[PDB]
RNA sequence: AGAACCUUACCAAAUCUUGACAUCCUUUGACAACUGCAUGGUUGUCGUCAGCUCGUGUCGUGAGAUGUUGGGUUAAGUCCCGCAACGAGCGCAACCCUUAAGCUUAGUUGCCAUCAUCUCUAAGUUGACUGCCGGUGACAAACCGGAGGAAGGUGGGGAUGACGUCAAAUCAUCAUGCCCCUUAUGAUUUGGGCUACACACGUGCUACAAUGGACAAUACAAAGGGCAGCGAAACCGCGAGGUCAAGCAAAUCCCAUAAAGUUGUUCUCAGUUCGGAUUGUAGUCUGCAACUCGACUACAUGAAGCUGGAAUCGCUAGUAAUCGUAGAUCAGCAUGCUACGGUGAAUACGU
């Protein structure tokens, strides 16, 4: 979802890997596919207005050189919500 | 945003009557089932047209004016110069995800310069504010221009839809003045009915030709989708089916080595060698079902139509003409409906 706390969160899983022995590459960011509703906006009657709503997913995997164990064990914890 | 019994909302038989939709020890079955003209709220509309204004001082007996008039600019009471006026909030502008050349930074299921086997993907930031430039316009807000400009003066669009509406579209999205049904068709299965026709019609569609018909073999993108489920490769009635087999939880697997197209191209205007409606017996999907009432496949079959009276409407270059596609509602069907890509011509002297 949300980007504002991912990226929050993509140098202190390096303070992680650097506390145990990983090292890391540059994990990469995933695309983002963006689903398109199209309601209309008056029940009764009427079609012709055609209100807009989307909902987005940003992909991200975390591509690195060297996954140590001790590392993988608290990294998939910190990006998606309820 | 799907009529085989859809929402039995409607109509016949039966049924149950706190039930069969908030109900019941899962049709009673210990258990596994054996009126919008009374109203809220959203919104249709003039209208992406630019306005509707109140505080507060004063002139008027008084409703009311003045400021909002005036001089010039100016998408737009948009901006600066005058005046019995002085301020002031609303919205276009303003806050902006998405848009158009960047370095440090981030090398996947992705691009590898070299041996051969830059951007999308997001981030703080960078860039056009007349900021300054020759003119003149009181120097007072604009002028073709222009130094940085790949990007012009709101760059190209979009969420943005005022004050105020025509008791006007909606009691069928939704609660209630009447509980917009609770014991009446109120509700539960098949069956009938929305699905037929003499016509009138909203609007779209396959077309009427050689700006072409057979089009076998023949290159490429973008934007989506999937353990409801995506189903290639070698390769089955050529074909209705994508068998078989692999990969698939998502860039890779699949949809899918699309589309405008180029070399073949035999036809000679023969109502056709243009064209589709539909007829007609076998044949696939679907389940309880293909009568009334689906949708695909080709062998065999082709009536009106040789570009359309008076009449209607679309639009300034990434639109127009359109071949092609991408999705939800589904066991199953839409050209609808709405998100992407290819060539991309015509015309602005003016009111």
């Known amino acids: ?10 140098e202190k899983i390096v303070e992680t890997a650097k506390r145990s022995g990983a090292d890391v590459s540059g994990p990469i960011p995933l695309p983002t596919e ?9 029940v009764h009657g009427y079609k012709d207005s055609r209100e807009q709503f989307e909902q987005r997913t940003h992909k991200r995997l975390i591509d690195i050189v060297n996954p140590t164990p001790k590392t993988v064990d608290a990294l998939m914890g910190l990006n998606l919500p309820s």
């Open 34 to 42: 963006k689903s398109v509703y199209t309601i209309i906006r008056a």
């Open 1 to 10: 979802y949300d980007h504002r706390v991912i990226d929050q969160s993509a």
